[PDB]
Amino acid sequence: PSVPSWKEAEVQTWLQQIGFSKYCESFREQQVDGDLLLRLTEEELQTDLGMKSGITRKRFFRELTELKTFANYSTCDRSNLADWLGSLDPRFRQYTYGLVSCGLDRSLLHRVSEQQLLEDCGIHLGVHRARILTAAREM
Amino acid sequence: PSVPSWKEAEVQTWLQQIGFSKYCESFREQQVDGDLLLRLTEEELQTDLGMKSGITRKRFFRELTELKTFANYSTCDRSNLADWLGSLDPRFRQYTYGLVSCGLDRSLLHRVSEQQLLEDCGIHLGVHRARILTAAREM
Amino acid sequence: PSVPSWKEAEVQTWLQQIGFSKYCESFREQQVDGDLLLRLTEEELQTDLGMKSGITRKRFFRELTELKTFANYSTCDRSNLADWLGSLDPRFRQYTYGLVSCGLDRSLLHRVSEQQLLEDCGIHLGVHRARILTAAREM
Amino acid sequence: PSVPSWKEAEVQTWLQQIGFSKYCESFREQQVDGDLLLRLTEEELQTDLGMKSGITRKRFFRELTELKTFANYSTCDRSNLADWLGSLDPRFRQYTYGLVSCGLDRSLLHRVSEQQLLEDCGIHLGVHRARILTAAREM
Amino acid sequence: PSVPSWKEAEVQTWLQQIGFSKYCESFREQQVDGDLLLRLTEEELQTDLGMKSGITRKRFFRELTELKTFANYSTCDRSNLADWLGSLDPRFRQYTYGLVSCGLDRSLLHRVSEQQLLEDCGIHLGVHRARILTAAREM
Amino acid sequence: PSVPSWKEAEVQTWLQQIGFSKYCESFREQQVDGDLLLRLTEEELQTDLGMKSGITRKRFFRELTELKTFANYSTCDRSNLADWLGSLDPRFRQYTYGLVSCGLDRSLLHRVSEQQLLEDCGIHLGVHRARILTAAREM
Amino acid sequence: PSVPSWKEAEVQTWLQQIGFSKYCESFREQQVDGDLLLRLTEEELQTDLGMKSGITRKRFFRELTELKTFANYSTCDRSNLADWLGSLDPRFRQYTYGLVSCGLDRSLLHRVSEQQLLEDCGIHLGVHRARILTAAREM
Amino acid sequence: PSVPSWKEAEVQTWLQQIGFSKYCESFREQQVDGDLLLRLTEEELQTDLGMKSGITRKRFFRELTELKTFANYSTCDRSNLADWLGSLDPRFRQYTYGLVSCGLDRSLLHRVSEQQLLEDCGIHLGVHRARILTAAREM
């Protein structure tokens, strides 16, 4: 909760909680705060955060998805896209920060393309992208 | 059975059972649990798990397919896709975890594309993908 | 005969018979049994089995084709595709294991594409693929 | 404010303010003034300014976006595109210098293509590009 | 004559006859018999047979074409494609083994594509391929 | 003024004036006169003139654009394209030498393609190219 | 004259005549006779004949074109394509050996494609290929 | 004048005249005569003539263009394309040798394609190619 407003110290605490204390050192070197944590990628992990293991990256991204599914986005979500995504599918709430970081709100969702969701918003599952796109044009 | 809920120790036991004790060490280094075992790939095997042999990877994937064909998915399969796939073909039950990990259930199967099955769900045989796709549009 | 049920020792015996005792050592290192022998490729030979000679790979694949032409597939061929392929052409019987390993039987042959035969079933001769495809749509 | 008219010293002061004193040295080596600061890229940062961290580049670009959102463009913006972009979206004001550096004003915005916005004007978010393009053809 | 049934020793004798005694050693290392001689390629020559000279490969392929033009194919040519090709053009008789190795006979020639002749049958001259294809559809 | 007729010494004087004395040495090594200065590129700068800095290349090209905007082209501009470009936009006068070096005059401007402007004339801004092309077809 | 029947010694004599005695040694190493001389390429020259100079290759190909323009092809030209090509253009007689080596005669010239002339016959000038093709369809 | 008939010594004299005495040595090593001088390229200069400077190559090609503009082509230009090109544009006379070396005369100019002018004739400016092509179809 209030992950978007997390500073570096909260990231260290969460990394210690989820079993990534070694990479807690690495993150503290790179000054990763809540915004950068919520907008992290595979390439950034590999090049900057010392995560050279694909399996360990998968476990970390599972834990990051778990954190994004239960985060509080009241600070950044004016249109309240979090419950919209959750109503679509409870596991779709993890895309809230990716959507709002693009400037997207509930109003302009109907003009969002699949390429935009893939690239600018960071939704990588084609099955998930289709369901979000389908509901977007429905409204 | 209950492979989706396996921790690391069950993976070690299964690896010892199927003749991969050397790679049991390697898996224990990479902390592979049941979810990661069911969602394993060739690239992950090669880069992270020390399996540099294509023939040995083939034998391991045969044994993994055997395990996925007889696994219990009651924890993760709410729509019970396992018996649906088995009714399609008894050897199609191995794709249950790949399908449910995508968020797919019995309801949205008719909108699944072949590209989605190839990429997001991990079905690599084109013959198998066509039969699943054909039955999906039939219902 | 009963090549699909061959263990490693039968592979060693056959390799000794066909003049590949040096590679009999290499195969025993890689634990190649009958299923892996029938599903072998050029890339697997080169990378895993020490066969760095293209000419020697050609001779080995001639001998493998001879073995596949006279193998007994009663264990794996429920629809009895072996005599169907032989009736098409006596040299087409070598593709029986490649076809049945895909889950294909006599019923679904009419929906098989040329891309599927090339990739999933391993038929590499375009002339052979066309004749199999032509007879498939005929029935 | 008056970022477009900043010399090197103002860049050093801003870099010290935003937590980039080490890179303040690097910028002073490369003589980066306000125009070059407003027209900076990822490639220029990496090759010329010693910023080898993708995460640190992300933080720097967040701070650069914050500075561009509140800069005064009265010197270079004759048609006053800054308030036009702000009326479109308050976070769109950061593109003012990229647009005016191309010679664009309010008059010729309706002939601007998406490729032009991506390449010549430096707008990298596809979602942002679409909204600017949509409003451009509207007027 | 009876080149398709040549063993290694006949290949050594022919290589000595045509001025390739050094490469006679190399061929004896690679166990090239009549079938492999008739189905030889540029890549196989370079990688396996020590023929690193393009000019020497050209001379060897001239001599191989001369041998294929006057070989006896009674053992392998049931439909007697040799005189058919010779009637088309006396220099077309060299393609008999390439055609029959594909399983092609006089009956199925009308369904043979140019891609098939280029790849599976090994006819590399586009002018020669067109003339064979033209006569194939004529009958 | 009279930049097209500048010899090497005037280039040295201008380089000293604009803050590039180190590269004044480098230019004097490469014998860059006014014609070569007006027809300079990024690749030529990097490979021949020691300008390995992208930021420094940007500053140099700003100063080169300033010089081209106020140069006198009476020697080479028979059709007087300089005031035509200036009437289009005062910052378009920098393209005069690039246009006249191609042999272009006011008469044949209507047949000039965008590819020609990009490649032969050296106009790299797509926004600038479109405006020049639009006015070209207008007349 | 009678270049198609030249052995190695005549090639040495011609090379000495045309100023390539050093490469006369190189050719004698590679056993280049008249047929190989008339069917020589740039790649063969570079890789096998020690001609690493593009300018020297150009001079050698000028001299080879001069020799091919005045060669006697009575041995190989049954349809007498040499005077046909000469009637088309006196400098087109150099393509006689390239055409006849493909099996082409005067009869089948009308079915020859531009791709065939470029690849199988070795005519590299597009202007020359068009004129030969145009006259081919005319007859 | 009479550049097409220049031997090596005239090339040395011209190179000394135009300020390329160092490369006069290099040309004398490569035996560049008038025909090779008139048919020179960037790649040949770089690889064979030691001209590793792009700027120096540009100056040399300016001087070569000046020489080609005032050369006498009476020996090679039977149709007198030189005055035709000069009438098109006085700076188009430099393409005379490139055109006549292709076998082109005034008669077949109307069938010349832009690809042919770019590749076989060596006209590299798209603006120049279009004007030559336009006048070619006009006649």
Q: Quickly list DSSP for chain B.
A: --GGG--HHHHHHHHHHTT-HHHHHHHHHHT--HHHHHT--HHHHHHHS----HHHHHHHHHHHHHHHHT---TTT-SS-HHHHHHHH-GGGGGGHHHHHHTT--SGGGGG--HHHHHHTS----HHHHHHHHHHHHH-
CA distances to A53, C19, C79, C139 from A27, rounded to whole Å, are 16, 59, 59, 63
Whether the CB of H76 is below 8 Å from some CB of chain G: the reply is no
* DSSP letter, residue E87: H
User: Is residue E82 within 8 Å of residue E73, measured between CB atoms?
Assistant: yes
Task: Classify C107 as helix, strand or coil.
Answer: helix
H91: closest CA among H125, H43, H54, H137?
H125
| Resolution given for this structure, in angstroms | 2.5
**Six-digit token pair at H63?**
């001087």
CA–CA gap between residue G31 and residue G17 (Å, rounded): 18
Inter-residue contact F67 to F3 (CB < 8 Å): yes
Q: Which of B61, B97, B107, B108 is nearest to A126 (CA)?
A: B108
Q: Which residues of chain E have a CB within 8 Å of the CB of G115?
A: 126
Query: How far is Cα G134 from Cα G126, in angstroms, rounded to an integer?
Result: 12
H52: nearest Cα among F122, F56, H60, F24: H60
Q: Rounded CA gap, E72 and E82, in Å?
A: 9
Rounded to an integer, what distance in angstroms lies between the CA atom of residue G100 and that of residue G102? 5
Same fold, H3-69 and H81-138: yes
Q: Which residues of C touch E45 (CB under 8 A)?
A: none
| Contact (CB, 8 A) for E4 and E38 | yes
Query: Regarding the domain with residue range H3-69, which homologous superfamily does it belong to in the CATH classification?
Result: Transcription Factor, Ets-1 (1.10.150.50)
Count of alpha carbons within 13 Å of A81, Cβ hemisphere only? 25
**Tokens 């006979």 sit at which residue?**
E105
Tokens 């590009």 sit on residue: D129
Q: How far is E77 from chain C (nearest CA, A)?
A: 15
Token readout for H127 is: 């603006």
φ/ψ of A106, rounded to 5, equals -65, -30
Please give the Cα distance from H101 to E45 (Å, whole number).
39
Give G75-81 contacts, CB < 8 A, sequence gap 24+: G75/G2, G75/G4, G75/G5, G76/G4, G76/G100, G76/G101, G78/G105, G79/G105, G79/G106, G79/G107, G80/G106, G81/G105, G81/G106, G81/G109
What are the tokens at A55?
């399996």
What's the Cα-to-Cα distance from B2 to each of B11, B13, B66, B72, C53, rounded to whole Å? 12, 14, 14, 5, 47
Say yes or no for a CB contact (<8 Å) between E54 and G31.
no
Under 8 Å between Cβ of A121 and B102: no
Question: Which residues have C-beta within 8 Å of that of residue E51, sequence separation ≥ 6?
Answer: E23, E26, E45, E57, E60
Neighbouring chains of D at 3+ CB pairs under 8 Å are A, F
Q: Which residues of A touch D127 (CB under 8 A)?
A: 102-104, 112, 116, 120-121
Q: Within 10 Å of residue C76's Cβ, how many Cβ atoms?
A: 16
Q: Across the interface, which of C54, C126, C128 has its CB nearest the CB of E119?
A: C126
CA dihedral B66, B103, A67, A12 (to 10 degrees): 40
Over the range H49-70, which residues count as b (16 or more CB within 10 Å of their CB) and which as e? bebebbbbbbbbbebbeebbbe
Q: What is the 3-state secondary structure (H, E, C) of E47-58?
A: HHCCCCCHHHHH
What would the two tokens of residue G111 be? 């079915």
Q: Cα separation of H84 and H135, whole Å?
A: 10
Nearest CA in chain F to H52: F48
Report how far Cα H110 is from the mean position of its chain's Cα atoms.
21
The answer to whether E79 touches E105, Cβ cutoff 8 Å, is yes
Class (C level, CATH) for E81-138: mainly alpha
Q: Are B75 and B4 in contact (CB under 8 A)?
A: yes
Crossing angle of helices H81-88 and H126-138, in 10° steps, is 110
For A113, the enclosing helix (H) or strand (E) is none
Q: Is A92 exposed, middle or buried (0-12, 13-18, 19+ CB in 10 A)?
A: buried
- Tell me, yes or no, whether chains D and H touch by having 3 or more C-beta pairs under 8 A: no
For residue D72, the surrounding DSSP H or E stretch is: none
The dihedral sign for the CA sequence D112, D116, D120, D122: positive
Question: Which pair of structure tokens corresponds to residue A62?
Answer: 């599972």
Give the C-alpha separation, H38 to H21, whole Å.
18
Most C CBs within 10 A among E33, E108, E109, E110, hence the mutation to make, goes to E108
CA G89 to chain centre: 15
- In eight-state DSSP terms, residue F137 is H
Taking the Cβ of residue D30 and every Cβ of chain F, the question of whether any pair is shorter than 8 Å is answered with yes
Cα–Cα distances in Å, from D101 out to A87, D35, H88? Answer: 44, 9, 39
CB C14 within 8 A of CB B42: no
Query: CB count, 10 Å around CB of D84?
Result: 21
CB proximity F108 to H under 8 Å: yes
What three-state secondary structure class fits F40?
Answer: coil
Tokens of H1: 């004048």
Q: Does D101 lie at the interface with A, CB-CB under 8 angstroms?
A: no
Q: What angle do CA B110, B111, B116 make, to 5 degrees?
A: 115
CA distance G111 to chain E (A): 9
Residues B51/B60, Cβ–Cβ less than 8 Å: yes
Angle between helices E81-88 and E126-138 (to 10 degrees): 110
d(CA A51, CA F30): 48
Boundaries of every domain in chain G: 3-69, 81-138
Q: E125 and G103: CB-CB below 8 Å?
A: yes
Chain F residues whose beta carbon lies within 8 Å of the beta carbon of residue H128: 102-103
D79 secondary structure, DSSP code: S
3-state secondary structure chain G: CCHHHCCHHHHHHHHHHCCCHHHHHHHHHHCCCHHHHHCCCHHHHHHHCCCCCHHHHHHHHHHHHHHHHCCCCCCCCCCCHHHHHHHHCHHHHHHHHHHHHCCCCCHHHHHCCHHHHHHCCCCCCHHHHHHHHHHHHHC
**Rounded Cα distance, B72 and G17, in Å:** 86
Of G102, G29, B74, F45, residue with least CA distance to H55: F45
Structure tokens at B36: 């990661």
Q: Cα–Cα distances in Å, from A133 out to A115, A118, A137, E99, G27?
A: 11, 11, 6, 54, 69
Residue B100's alpha-carbon distances to D127, E22, E93, H49, in angstroms, are 30, 63, 60, 66
CB C37 within 8 A of CB C6: yes
* H47 touches G: beta carbon within 8 Å: yes
The experimental technique behind this entry is cryo-EM
CB E54 within 8 A of CB G44: yes
Q: How far apart are CA C119 and CA A100, in angstroms?
A: 43
Q: Tell me how far apart the alpha carbons of residues F32 and A126 are, in angstroms, rounded to a whole number.
A: 55
Q: Which residues of G112-125 are buried (b: 16+ CB within 10 A; e: fewer)?
A: beeebbeebbbbeb
> What number of helices (H) and strands (E) belong to chain D?
9, 0
d(CA A20, CA A26) in angstroms, rounded, equals: 10
Q: Which residue numbers come right before each break in chain G (C to N over 2.5 Å)?
A: none
Asked whether the beta carbons of E97 and E39 are under 8 A apart, the reply is yes
- At A40, the amino acid letter reads L
* A115 contact D CB<8A: yes
- The residue among F80, F29, F75, F83 whose CA lies nearest residue F51 is F29
Label residues D20-55 b or e (16+ Cβ within 10 Å = b).
beebbebbeebebbbbbbbbbeeebbeebbebebbb
What's the alpha-carbon Rg for chain C, to the nearest Å?
Answer: 15
Do residues F102 and H127 make contact, with C-beta atoms less than 8 angstroms apart?
yes
Residues of A in Cβ contact (< 8 Å) with D89: 103
Q: How many CB pairs under 8 A join B and C?
A: 47
How many G×H Cβ pairs under 8 Å? 47
Structure tokens, B55 = 């023939």
Tokens matching residue F69: 């905007």
The total of other beta-carbon atoms located within 10 Å of residue G70's CB is 10
Q: How far apart are CA G30 and CA G50, in angstroms?
A: 10
Using DSSP's 3-state secondary structure scheme, residue B2 falls into: coil
Kindly list the residues from chain E whose CB atom is less than 8 angstroms away from the CB atom of residue C42.
none
* Distance, CA of G44 to CA of H32 (rounded, Å): 23
Q: How far apart are CA B42 and CA B65, in angstroms?
A: 13
Indicate yes or no: CB of D55 within 8 angstroms of CB of A49.
yes
The single-letter DSSP state of residue F103 is: T
CB-based contact, C130 to chain E, within 8 Å: yes
CA dist., res. H116 & res. H119, Å (int): 5
Measured CA to CA, the distance from residue G95 to residue G128 in angstroms comes to 10
CB spacing of A39 vs D58 below 8 angstroms:
yes
Extract the tokens encoding C123.
Answer: 């038929």
Residues 6+ apart with CB under 8 A from F66: none
In the structure encoding, which two tokens stand for residue F38, read together?
Answer: 């007006």
Rounded CA-CA distance D61/D38 in Å is: 11
The position carrying tokens 């405006």 is F131
Angle between helices B81-88 and B126-138 (to 10 degrees): 110
Specify the amino acid at residue E101: S
- Residue F59 host element (H or E): helix F54-69
Distance (Å, whole) CA B77 – CA F68: 70
B104 Cβ under 8 Å from any chain A Cβ:
yes
Chain A residues near residue B43 by CB distance under 8 angstroms: 54
A117: which 2 tokens? Answer: 């969701």
Q: At A50, is the secondary structure helix, strand, or coil? A: coil
Q: How far is CA F128 from each of CA D19, F102, F114, rounded to the nearest angstrom?
A: 37, 18, 10
Distance, in Å, from the CA atom of D102 to the CA atom of F126, rounded to the nearest integer, reads 9
H53 touches chain F (CB under 8 A): yes
G34 CB neighbour count, 10 Å cutoff: 19
Q: Is the dihedral of CA G102, G104, G108, G113 positive or negative?
A: positive
DSSP H or E run through B51:
none
* Closest of B72, B79, B85 to residue B132, by C-alpha: B85
CB A64 within 8 A of CB D75: no
* DSSP conformation letters of E5-37: G--HHHHHHHHHHTT-HHHHHHHHHHT--HHHH
| CA–CA distance, C36 with F87 (Å, rounded to integer) | 77
* Contact residues for B49 (Cβ-Cβ < 8 A; gap 6+): A55, B23, B26, B27, B30, B32
Report chain D residues whose CB lies below 8 A from the CB of A31: 55-56, 59
Q: What angle do CA G57, G60, G64 make, to 5 degrees?
A: 130
Q: B81 with B106: CB under 8 angstroms?
A: yes
Taking the C-alpha atoms of residue G44 and residue G57, their distance in angstroms, rounded to an integer, is 11
**Helix (H), strand (E) counts: chain B:** 9, 0
The amino acid at residue A41 is: T
Q: Please indicate whether, in this complex, the C-beta atoms of C103 and B89 are within 8 angstroms of each other.
A: yes
Nearest to G32 among E55, E126, E128 (CB): E55
CA-based nearest residue to E69, from E55, E40, E89, E53: E89
